[PDB]
């Protein structure tokens, strides 16, 4: 009568246990080898020549640089536009200001701020946090729809008199992400989700917390802020609400390089979520150690 795979698997047991680290040397984890795995019966080969390791390390260099290259591209665009317009920049974010002030010190503080931001370039940043929704499948159709509907001639009268309503394209509130740098105590705020609105009185921008409260930056001389829009417009603003603006340029990368890295996840259905598309959901299952385990 038959021997069972699990029984000989148990009785054979294991004898191998070692820890391995990720290439960045940031995480450790254990690998276990069972003496009844079919790995031992296979008797296949192994090769670890130096050229292959060198090529893999070059691929890793690209994988790492995918974010810092976007940082560098936006930096170079900032400087290029700063020379382009002669450095004299208009007001773009609304706040009251004085003509009798030492603007030179704020210019030097701006230099300090951009240098300090360049040092603290990181994977979490407004450019990456704005890129990530751009990669999702909906963004192509959504931006296509937004451009198409924006590209609408003024309605003929019968269109407005009859049928389903006419509508306005954008909502009154914009969704933004920003990088906040403070020089008086070297400190940079990168993972910021922020709301923005374009003022009706003047065409300038008012910026709000994700509570409805106004932000404090424009008043504080020691702070500079970077802004990116959901359509990837871009601003670098120094105290007084004066900003440098340009496109976020990303033609310096191939599609797969950034796409494989920053692909936002989409779920596959597992216990504790509704089969109807996008329906409301209960609180998470969370198999947990604080309660007596169920079967």
């Amino acid at each position: 009568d038959e021997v069972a795979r699990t029984d000989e698997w148990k009785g054979a047991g294991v004898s191998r246990l070692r820890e391995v680290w990720d290439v960045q040397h940031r995480v450790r984890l254990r690998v276990l080898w069972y003496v009844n795995s079919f790995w031992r019966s296979r008797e296949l080969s192994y090769d670890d020549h130096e050229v292959e390791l060198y090529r893999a390390l070059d691929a890793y260099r690209a994988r790492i640089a995918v974010e810092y290259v976007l940082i560098r591209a936006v930096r170079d665009e900032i400087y290029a536009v700063l020379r382009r317009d002669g450095g004299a920049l208009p007001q773009r974010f609304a706040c009251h200001v004085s003509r009798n002030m030492s603007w030179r010190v704020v210019w030097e503080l701006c230099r300090h701020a951009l240098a300090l931001w360049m040092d603290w370039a990181d994977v979490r940043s407004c450019i990456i946090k704005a890129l990530t929704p751009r990669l999702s499948r909906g963004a192509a159709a959504a931006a296509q729809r937004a451009r198409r509907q924006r590209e609408r001639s003024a309605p003929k009268p019968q269109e407005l008199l009859f049928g389903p309503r006419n509508e306005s394209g954008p909502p009154a509130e914009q969704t933004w992400y920003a990088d906040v740098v403070r020089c008086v105590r070297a400190q940079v705020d990168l993972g910021v989700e922020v709301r923005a609105a374009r003022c009706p009185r003047t065409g300038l921008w008012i910026v709000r917390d994700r509570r409805g409260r106004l932000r404090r930056w424009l008043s504080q001389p020691e702070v500079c802020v970077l802004y990116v829009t959901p359509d990837l417009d871009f601003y670098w603003v120094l105290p007084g609400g004066f900003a440098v603006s340009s496109r976020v340029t990303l033609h310096g990368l191939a599609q797969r390089a950034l796409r494989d890295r920053f692909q936002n996840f989409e779920a596959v259905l597992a216990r504790g979520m509704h089969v109807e598309a996008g329906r409301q959901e209960p609180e998470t299952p969370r198999v947990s150690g604080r309660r007596l385990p169920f079967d």
């Binding site: 009568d1 038959e2 069972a4 079967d295």
Partner: protein
């Protein structure tokens, strides 16, 4: 109201069963004249894999009687086929003693104006500890496949769950050992074809405050029981689950 039937049994089977309250089962064996032999849970406790050794030996001494041996010997051939060989006849209310005895059991009824159903202790278990107001009660057989041969377990259990599907859903939950042992038997030896892991029969409903624990005596020997003080009988079919 109640419906009654009359039966003949010989004394050797009746001895410990002679007390008024019991549950009666019929054995069919491929013999020629004694095809059907009438046995009870008191005798079946000898082969119940879930009863303790001391009570097992107590019943072994109690049913040394000659006919009970041959009755027990017929249980040997086929553990998986046990519930096939069994058929149930309700619970007993009458007794007259003799070499050949006349006893009566009800198939569907109660006693107007005492009528209890006795259970040997290790045959009893509950999935509740605060009893519901109305308790449905069952005879269930579960098979232990993890061995050199399969051994049968016997239980009578009380539960308020009336719907069969949810009932078996929880029974599988607590009897997962027998499911896994069944599949272990299947993976081990495909030569003999095993049937279900457990068998349910529905017979009864009672009120929780009318459930008593009781002490029982026969032949100056003494065994303790759980009893359903006012038993209502509604005999169902054996139903299988894996």
């Amino acid at each position: 109201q109640a419906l009654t039937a009359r039966f003949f049994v010989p004394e050797g089977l009746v001895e410990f069963e002679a007390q008024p309250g019991a549950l009666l089962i019929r054995m069919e064996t491929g013999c020629d004249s004694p095809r059907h032999l009438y046995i009870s849970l008191y005798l079946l406790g000898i082969r119940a894999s879930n009863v303790s050794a001391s009570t097992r030996c107590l019943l072994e001494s109690v049913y040394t009687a000659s006919a009970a041996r041959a009755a027990l010997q017929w249980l040997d051939l086929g553990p998986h086929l046990l519930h096939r060989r069994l058929e149930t006849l309700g619970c007993v209310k009458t007794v007259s003693l003799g070499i050949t005895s006349l006893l009566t059991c009800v198939m569907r009824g109660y006693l107007y104006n005492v009528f209890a159903l006795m259970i040997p202790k290790d045959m009893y278990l509950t999935w509740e500890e605060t009893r519901g107001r109305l308790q449905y009660v069952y005879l269930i057989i579960v098979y232990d496949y993890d061995g050199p041969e399969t051994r049968p377990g016997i239980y009578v259990l009380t539960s308020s769950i009336a719907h069969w599907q949810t009932l078996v859903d929880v029974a599988r939950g607590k009897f997962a050992r027998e499911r896994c042992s069944f599949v272990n038997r299947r993976i081990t030896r495909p030569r003999q074809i095993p049937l279900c892991t457990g068998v349910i029969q529905k017979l009864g409903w009672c009120l929780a405050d009318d459930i008593h624990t009781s002490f029982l005596v026969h032949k100056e020997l003494k065994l303790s029981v759980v009893r359903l003080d006012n038993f209502s009988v509604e005999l169902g079919d054996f139903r299988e689950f894996v």
